[PDB]
Design a protein around this nucleic acid. Sequence first.
RNA 1: GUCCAGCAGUGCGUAGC
DNA 2: GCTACGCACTGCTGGA
Length: 470
Amino acid sequence: KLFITQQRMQKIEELLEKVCSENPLDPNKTKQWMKASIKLSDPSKAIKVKPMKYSPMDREEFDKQIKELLDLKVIKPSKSPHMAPAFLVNNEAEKRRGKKRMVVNYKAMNKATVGDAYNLPNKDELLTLIRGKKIFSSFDCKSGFWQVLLDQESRPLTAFTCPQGHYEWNVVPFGLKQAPSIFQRHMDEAFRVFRKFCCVYVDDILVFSNNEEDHLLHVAMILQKCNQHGIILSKKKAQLFKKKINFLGLEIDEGTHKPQGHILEHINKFPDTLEDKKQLQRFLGILTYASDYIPKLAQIRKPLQAKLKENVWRWTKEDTLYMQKVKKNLQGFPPLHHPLPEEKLIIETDASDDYWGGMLKAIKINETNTELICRYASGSFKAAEKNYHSNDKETLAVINTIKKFSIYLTPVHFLIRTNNTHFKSFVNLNYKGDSKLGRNIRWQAWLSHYSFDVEHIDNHFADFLSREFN
RNA sequence: GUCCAGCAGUGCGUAGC
DNA sequence: GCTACGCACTGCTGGA
């Protein structure tokens, strides 16, 4: 018996081994393909930032990390006229990685260099590409920027300082403004030919297929592409043949998507009683990652945002009991539908005195159909917009929802459900009101770029949440 | 402390009424 | 007073 499929898996596993390494400059695995150029734009000047002070724990670790970096031959001793300070950072990735991360403050040199015009992808334009796919693999480059060689005139620009002195970089360092663009350009050049089953966000390669069979071919082609170009992957971070893949901070399924669980876990580390305002802004910061997933989250967040104002610190038993509910639903909100390419899309929108809301729905086809929720949007009205009439806030809710969902809606005939009985006449340029003509023509122009019908207006999760809060 | 991205916000200039 | 577009800056989070 053959087991030709297990043979293909071992072949994939060997291609993976062939392109993985812990050294981004690995002499057996790089062709020195990727090169970059960084230009002052006023070459006459010198960019000198005052150094920093270093504690012993940091002066120690620096010594360890600098020997590593010197050993990889990514940095080297420098007598450059430019200098930028290095420091260590300890954020949630570092805490769990077990190692402090070194950062060079390149703000001054970034102000001072010619930009790279090359744009990064939009996260929604990548996600819409994988709608319908069943199987995924994902690959992070090993310290990717460090695989791009800097030419001789550009390396002095990278010179930094640290306890052990004055070094510069032989490769593109993290923290330069051009680096994501330089790397994205290279990944697009290596892999654009496989755009039908592969996309890259800077650093991260995603392979997607609608079944295991295709995937064996798809992954092998990407891995043989890395080998051809000397692109070094990180074995520890390879996600091979997964039904659920982590990508762009999301957990994505054939039919569903949610934030990565390890992100919204940190909500449950906050107390029900916040000590100070600085901790409240830490809390609001992470609560941000639920906006696509909680209906009317702008409102839920407003009571808390108030406390942040300098004008206002007084925590109450209600403040405490508010935290508890908020914490309970900001973890364990249900995953949302990732719509198939051919599924018909609907947006339902609503408005209140101070906020707008909208919700994206898809029509799952069943031989009686079904409407699945894909994404939520919410926000509060600008200063001038609170004086809008109640029909125009409802129209604004339509516009803001489309804007948020525009990557999905733009190429498709979709359906808007609103409570503005005059919205239908308005978009058909049949609207009577001449009072605010310029704003109306502006909206009519903007809405003209979309193709849609209109209906007048089953979200029990949102009904639960509203009940449980007031 | 950089950089990308998420969320909220502040200021400013230019152009039109 | 309004609109627009686009520059500068701030706080927090995620991560490289």
